[PDB]
Amino acid sequence: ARTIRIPVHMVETINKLSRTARQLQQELGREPTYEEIAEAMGPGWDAKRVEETLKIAQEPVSLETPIGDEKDSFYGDFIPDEHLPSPVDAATQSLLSEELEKALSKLSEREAMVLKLRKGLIDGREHTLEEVGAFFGVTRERIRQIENKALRKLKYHESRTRKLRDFLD
Amino acid sequence: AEPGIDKLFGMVDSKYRLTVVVAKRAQQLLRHGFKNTVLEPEERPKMQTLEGLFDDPNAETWAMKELLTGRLVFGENLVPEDRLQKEMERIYPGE
Amino acid sequence: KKEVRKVRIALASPEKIRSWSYGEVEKPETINYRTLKPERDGLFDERIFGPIKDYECACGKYKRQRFEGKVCERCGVEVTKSIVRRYRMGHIELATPAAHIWFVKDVPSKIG
Amino acid sequence: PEWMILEAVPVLPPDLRPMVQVDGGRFATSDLNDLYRRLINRNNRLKKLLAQGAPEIIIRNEKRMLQEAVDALLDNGRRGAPVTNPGSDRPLRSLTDILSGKQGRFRQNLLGKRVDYSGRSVIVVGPQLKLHQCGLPKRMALELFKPFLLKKMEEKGIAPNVKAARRMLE
Amino acid sequence: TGGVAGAADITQGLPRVIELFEARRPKAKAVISEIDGVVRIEETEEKLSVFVESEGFSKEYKLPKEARLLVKDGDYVEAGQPLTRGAIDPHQLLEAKGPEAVERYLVEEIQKVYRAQGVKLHDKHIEIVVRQMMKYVEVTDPGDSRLLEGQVLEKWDVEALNERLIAEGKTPVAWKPLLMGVTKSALSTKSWLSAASFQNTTHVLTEAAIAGKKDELIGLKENVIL
Amino acid sequence: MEIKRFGRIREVIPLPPLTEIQVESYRRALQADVPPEKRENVGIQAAFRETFPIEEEDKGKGGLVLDFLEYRLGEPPFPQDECREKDLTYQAPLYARLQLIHKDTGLIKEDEVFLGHIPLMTEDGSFIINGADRVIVSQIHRSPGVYFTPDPARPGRYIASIIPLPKRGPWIDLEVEPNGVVSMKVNKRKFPLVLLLRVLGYDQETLARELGAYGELVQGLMDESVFAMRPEEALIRLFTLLRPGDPPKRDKAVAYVYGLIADPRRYDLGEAGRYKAEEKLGIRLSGRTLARFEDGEFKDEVFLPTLRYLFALTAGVPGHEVDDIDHLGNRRIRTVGELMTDQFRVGLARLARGVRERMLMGSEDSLTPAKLVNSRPLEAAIREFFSRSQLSQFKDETNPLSSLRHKRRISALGPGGLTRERAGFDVRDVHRTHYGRICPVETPEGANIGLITSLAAYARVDELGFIRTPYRRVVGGVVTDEVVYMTATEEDRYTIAQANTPLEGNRIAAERVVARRKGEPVIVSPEEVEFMDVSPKQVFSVNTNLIPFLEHDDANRALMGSNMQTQAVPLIRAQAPVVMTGLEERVVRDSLAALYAEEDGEVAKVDGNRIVVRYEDGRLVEYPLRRFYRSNQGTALDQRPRVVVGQRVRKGDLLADGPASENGFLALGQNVLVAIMPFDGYNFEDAIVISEELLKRDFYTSIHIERYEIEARDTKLGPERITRDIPHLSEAALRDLDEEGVVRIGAEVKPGDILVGRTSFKGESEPTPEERLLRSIFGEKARDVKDTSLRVPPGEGGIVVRTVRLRRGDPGVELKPGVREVVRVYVAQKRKLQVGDKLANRHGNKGVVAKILPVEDMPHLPDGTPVDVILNPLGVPSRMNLGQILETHLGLAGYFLGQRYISPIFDGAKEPEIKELLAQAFEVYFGKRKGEGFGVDKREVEVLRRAEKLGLVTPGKTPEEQLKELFLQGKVVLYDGRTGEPIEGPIVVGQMFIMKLYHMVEDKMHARSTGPYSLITQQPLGGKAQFGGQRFGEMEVWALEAYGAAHTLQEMLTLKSDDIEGRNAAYEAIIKGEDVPEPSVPESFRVLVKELQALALDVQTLDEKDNPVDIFEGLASKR
Amino acid sequence: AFNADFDGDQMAVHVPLSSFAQAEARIQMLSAHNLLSPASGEPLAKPSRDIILGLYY
Amino acid sequence: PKISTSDPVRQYL
Ligand SMILES: Nc1nc2c(ncn2[C@@H]2O[C@H](COP(=O)(O)OP(=O)(O)O)[C@@H](OP(=O)(O)OP(=O)(O)O)[C@H]2O)c(=O)[nH]1
Ligand SMILES: [Mg+2]
Ligand SMILES: [Mg+2]
Ligand SMILES: [Mg+2]
Ligand SMILES: [Zn+2]
Fold it and tell me: Which positions does UniProt annotate for Zn(2+) 1 binding (chain C)?
């Protein structure tokens, strides 16, 4: 009986609330607060809590709800996208790339590939690259300086011909 | 109005061909710089900004100026498919 | 690269239906008040319809873009452009068939 | 003539029926998404009941309830529509309602799309104007022509690059 | 100004134009002769009937007490001609003088309305529209399709000559002509990708999917929706 | 100054208190002043005394017997304007004593239980709901009573409809069947009538054809006399139409209902219907329906005459009326009170329902006080009204007048049939009974015409709810002041005469007297008259009554006037007009535009802020001068004092002007020297030109307060902040900010500048596969916060006046769920006149400022005085609004005469007196041109020639007095400010009064290059900094098809809307300087297929040779 | 043609993008090539108001 | 053909 599946005791928590709310609606005359409910619900209940068990409790809204005009506009009509890149973004998030193969293209395939294993292939490599000998190379107190052979190489060609400065904001 | 609008109408059998001609013509005319321009140094379009006459970036406006000299030729068939997609690249640098 | 000139519309053979689909939705579940992730074999299961976020999977074992199309061992979630969620068809299998209503109530009752 | 009868029900891709979060930890979704759940519990509950090999009477009632269900999804209203239990008595916008824009959507359709290089303003007469021109706010133009403008800014010394050229303007 | 009191009043303005485009038996339906002939008017003090008679036949139209007489005892009434004042029903005049007569009637009583409000618009435009109004035929002599079937007149380029001629051999097709208003003349398109739009889709698609109807995108609409 | 008052039609009474409809209804809809314990019913008391005593007690084990005791309300939680700031609905707490009675007799007193508290009306007319100001538009409907109607479903005879007004009540229609019997519509469930007539306690042989004496074809009656015997079985033999069946043992189940039991009536204790049913049918009441106390069946005084008058109507000509639903005797207004009263009736229809519930669910001994009586079903019921009711809306307050017109509104929409059924030409038509009851000339333009409507100046709503206009009774041609407020119906009983009958004191001095006789105008003799029109005014709304020379103004274009004064927006040099109608002062007072003195006294203090006054009784009361306050519509409401220190003063004298009052005088616009004439196209079609000089005088300047908000929400990605530290590239662009988020009160803001800085978590933890490589180089803190700072929307902001920083709402401000804090900012801007600004006059002239010339160019008078505004004249024959010329003339006088006038609505200045006023004005102007030593110009010679030829002036008369003629016509002689030569022919200059129409943000200047996009459909969408695109509707689509604009159309249909892929493809090309590419499929189509797809129909797109083509390139294809 | 006066009628403006669209727009939508009317044949950009009032006099 | 539709409840019972 809900568009979002919920644990069976989580239903009973709200089904205790639903029972508890009616008493405090008449016992106080007014609508009780988040502080008012915990001190009545059970020993281990918080003020901040209820707010979450109430956000959780809701319907929720139907994209097919009509909006004021009643005739044409539905609720969903006014909900924007932000997952997809926009014409401005997408183009930026491809001019940044087509400049990277025009930035570290004249770099070593380890001054670039280390950062293309650390960052150019998606996995943190915080404590994953120093252990594995990385196929053919040298490890230990030198990889924590190989990103000084690699990451700090990108600083100058960026500060001189200021290509990458503006791509921040 | 626009230059010799009437005369440029007469060049074609129908309204729309001249629109197809002009646009397509302009496409090439502002694909390969303006390197293909069958229109001489002195009969090129110009602006007035910064106090300096510099050639008009308006491709669409060039092709019209061009066709108006009859230097182009147009038809339903003139060349094959990708067989033109190489000829104009070599005669006029396709970079 | 062949251009389009006609638009056919015909009936759907379940085989054809089952052709388009990408996996039986078996569960009445949607999303999770906790993880906000879709449910396994549920209406939003990334397994069936496609990854939520671009170039990734559900569990998170295969990343980046080079491997443009590589089903995962732990989840199976194809690592290809998330947009594929707004197209990719799913289906429900039926313990008994039930007549499609247009061909039943629209008169002349096309089956009647 | 059997393909008219359904045994494999296809299911609309999820994105065009989304489950987005809006304000105050509350969500919004489609009726389609709630029309499917009610279907499944019934097909799923049938598999139990049939597996169990229960009496026919009840094996029936569930199929009645399954026809009623697939009906209300394909075309909800051709037998007295179901609604979102409490809330209100609004019928659920079914794939049928959706296509033919049943509820003021086909009237919304012809109100057209929206266009990405457009603008609007009040009109003041322009006598000095010649027949083939108009008085336009430069203010307006620089939105409208933005991307065309950013290039000329790059072509000229006005910007180093487009992001800076766009930045120059926000 | 100074008219209506309890009698038959003709339609005027936009109603009339919709009345002429979708037509539609009009308000004051005028009587018209089924046939050529000459006039004889017999009458009781209350009863009235007009007789149109060409040698063999005798046609009798019993016009109501209210009716106004547009024709003189012993005149020639070319078939289709109105015997009362008012308004012709096009279907009636279709059945009696065929296509071109209905058409130049249609076009006109239409243009009549506009020009009387001083709108000068070129006959051809109304023509074009009435033409489609007349687009469809309804098979009488079958050839390989069931009896009635209303459908587009010009699919008869090759498929009317195919009886001895082009695809060679078999039965020749005959067809009744059809007057249908702009509305109804639209729901009957080749294009299901159009016909979907117009008044209720449900039924259009049922029938389109059964037949496996291909939509040649020919009209501007189909190409736009796509 | 001198204000010469005009006209003589001596008004025996000024217009009533104007917001009457709104204030007085609510006063009696609550009753909380003189009322002691038991006092009256009409209002809320009724909603109590109806649902009480609620009873659900059986003589078996227990039950419910709950009776009404008392009600009360008091302490409004928060003071008036505090509700506005804290977004709280200004209201009061409503208590009620109840007490429960026991089956073994016991009285434990449930005292004051305020489980439900109600809103309060402001002093001026409106309400405060969730901060905002609102109005409750009173509404028109078909009255309660019995009416007789002809049948459009059978071109012939009549139908008899009994109509009450309960909130679930029954309709009783009495028609004769197509099969020659008697239909009786109780619901839609029709049945042969006769049946019930027996149950009324009346048989078929006591009064049958006796009172059916004209029943000569009474064959709806004939069928079953072998049925009419006993009412015990006749009451059973009716229950037939009831599903799905019931045993008739307790047969008096629906029978008991339609007697007295409160729900079949139109009013309690008879009345309302009985009021009309005094002369409609019989005479009196049975109780309130067909009421019977304690007898066999049920007494009837209602059903019996209902037939027997349909009889009398179907008889020759006795009684014999056929009803008019357009008639105001049959149409009532449901006021704020009633509309809300029958909303408290619907609340106690659920509170009582909850009480019965706790009898099985609840005990019978455990719940003694009230463990079942709940506020929640009353609490939501009223707020679904005041907040959500159609009939409630935003308060118009563009200016004081607009704020007063809104309380005086009438709609047919809401609960009564609306638009979808239309009933056009009917209803929407101005009815013969509207004289002095509704303005025939006030209504919205377009769709909602004749539906929404405004109450005539003198109009009044009586204790029942019928609109009354006042008439003074006249006897024997001697007119008395004894003035009566007749109804619609009372009116039809007399021969009333028009307001402008020539009089001689008391006495009529007229042969033929021009009079209405129940609508029809007839020239009559004095002896026949009985009542006379009070004022020409009483025929029109107030907005209408403010237009001088109305009589010369065609109604269409004067409607526009009535309307546009709503869009007057207080100038900061608000002027009252040069020619006035009379209602100027009286509006400003009744509106509460200005601040008046409530007793006689001496002024203590005066500053911009407040005034303290010492009244003759000893009271030193302080009046704040409500200062720079924000209206609903932005327009600044606030007072400005017109009194100095220790200035002795009378009661009702002016202390502070309105925002649009110039000494108690309604000050909506500005008076200006207008030349009317064409000017070089610059006023081509209603366009208007403007002397720069108007701007230097700050003439059409206007101060506008704009309110912004920003939220601090809790998030699933972690709380977002209102920090001054936005992460970007600037610090020199944070100056005016500093204030720990907020922008400093006082700063200039242009578009793009930041009102409130904000940082939000966005991206889903990780840095972009590209930006992870990026930010490292700079120093990858790469803070997980974003620039969601509240920015200045494009197209002007202004300078800051006030910010409001509300965190956690701990002072008593109701928070928003999952929202930490909210910042407000307020931006003010003086808005001068400008090319685009629109301009209007009360005679319906509306045009846009198409050119602001410098004064070096303007046409000037001989004394060098140039003109302010140039109004093309072609916008006038076709309109037929001559009042604008009768205004421009009188102006030309009062200008030099140094005066202003009061013409009244149909009385007022006449053509003689005005030329005569121009005669004295010709002295001031010209009769002192020679005493300065100057004769006539060499160009006046040149004109006068051409003038006398035009046949304007006398040939022969002197070049001096030729001009005087010419000036009495209104035209003077202008010199083209450019050349210095004259305008051939004279031009009528003169003063005219003009108002700057108000700015809506819908009709703000808009422009999109590109921005956001709807999630679902993926069509372009609006932000706040971003304006969406234009709807490209079907109609515009055809536009280009027609044009053979092929590509263009398609790119409006893809590239610039739904083509997800191609729009990106496009952008890039344009940036690079490449030519735009061709486009993919639009989500329009893709999503289309998928919907069909979903419905089990295979939709293939075949190529040339019928081979599927991939519209979803890759993606959707399997394997 | 537009049927617009200046008591505040608003217009909307679009930009045609593709070098073809502008081609179309100039050769077949430019307000100085569409002089006559599709309905009548008669010219539809004519002296109108002030323009006549001037010329007549 | 409309006498009753919402039988599912009644029908079963
Ligand atoms: N073709 C066409 N005409 C329209 C349209 N809308 C209005 N008109 C014509 O313009 C004239 C006046 O229009 P309005 O603008 O209403 O007049 P108004 O200034 O007095 O309000 C009318 O005829 P008129 O007075 O005879 O015109 P004219 O002689 O003033 O030009 C009317 O028929 C339209 O969409 N198309
Ligand atoms: Mg702005
Ligand atoms: Mg006009
Ligand atoms: Mg207008
Ligand atoms: Zn995985």
Answer: 57, 59, 72, 75
CA F1004 – ligand 2 centroid, Å: 9
Q: Is F878 in the pocket of ligand 1 (CB under 6 A)?
A: yes
User: How far is the centre of ligand 4, averaged over its atoms, from the C-alpha of G10 (Å)?
Assistant: 9
Q: List CB contacts (< 8 A) between C68 and chain F.
A: none
Domain borders along chain A are 6-59, 85-166
The rounded Å distance from CA F418 to ligand 4 centre is: 27
Nearest residue of chain D to residue E211 (CA atoms): D1
Q: What is the resolution of this structure in A?
A: 2.7
Tokens 């601040």, residue located:
F595
Among G2, G3, G6, name the best residue to mutate to test ligand 1's pocket (greatest count of ligand atoms within 8 A of Cβ): G3
Which region, left, alpha or beta, applies to residue F268 given φ > 0 means left and ψ of -120 to 50 means alpha?
beta
Pairing of strands F899-902, F579-580: parallel
Residues making up chain B, counted from first to last:
95
Please report residues of A whose CB lies closer than 8 A to that of C28: 5
Burial (0-12, 13-18, 19+ Cβ within 10 Å), E100: exposed
Distance in angstroms (rounded) separating the CA atoms of residues F239 and F191:
12
Distance set, CA F353 to CA A22, A25, F347, F1009 (Å): 16, 18, 10, 58
Helix axes E14-21, E90-115, angle to 10 degrees: 150
Taking an 8 Å cut-off on Cβ atoms, the answer to whether C86 and D16 are in contact is: yes
User: In this complex, do E210 and C7 lie within 8 Å of one another by their Cβ atoms?
Assistant: no
CATH code linked to domain F701-832? 2.40.50.150
CB neighbours of residue F1105 within 10 Å:
8
Are chains E and C touching, using the cut-off of 8 Å on CB pairs and a minimum of 3 such pairs?
A: yes
Q: Which of E115, E120, E126 to mutate to test the interface with G (most CBs of G within 10 A)?
A: E120
Are F902 and F4 in contact, with CB atoms under 8 Å apart? yes
Q: What is the CATH number of domain F470-534?
A: 2.30.150.10
Q: Is A85-166 in CATH node 3.20.20.70?
A: no
C-alpha to C-alpha distance for E100 and E96, rounded to whole angstroms: 11
Look at domain F594-658 and name its CATH class.
Answer: mainly beta
Residue F43 structure tokens: 């209002």
Contact (Cβ atoms closer than 8 angstroms) between residue F31 and residue F45: yes
**What residues in chain G have their Cβ under 8 A from chain D's Cβ atoms?**
4, 6, 8-15, 17, 30-32, 45
Question: Please, where in chain F does CATH 3.90.1110.10 lie?
Answer: 144-323
Q: Do chains D and G touch (3 or more CB pairs under 8 A)?
A: yes
Q: How far is F930 from F934, CA to CA, in rounded Å?
A: 5
CB contacts of C44 in chain D (<8 Å) are: 14, 19
* Spatial CA neighbour of F691 closest among F982, F977, F899: F977
Residue F648 corresponds to which tokens in the numbers above?
Answer: 């002795």
Domains in chain B with CATH codes: 1-95 (3.90.940.10)
Fold of F1-6+668-700+833-997: 2.40.270
What was the experiment behind these coordinates?
Answer: X-ray
* CB of F704 closer than 8 Å to CB of F796: no
The superfamily in CATH containing domain F144-323 is RNA polymerase Rpb2, domain 2 (3.90.1110.10)
Structure tokens at C73: 């061992």
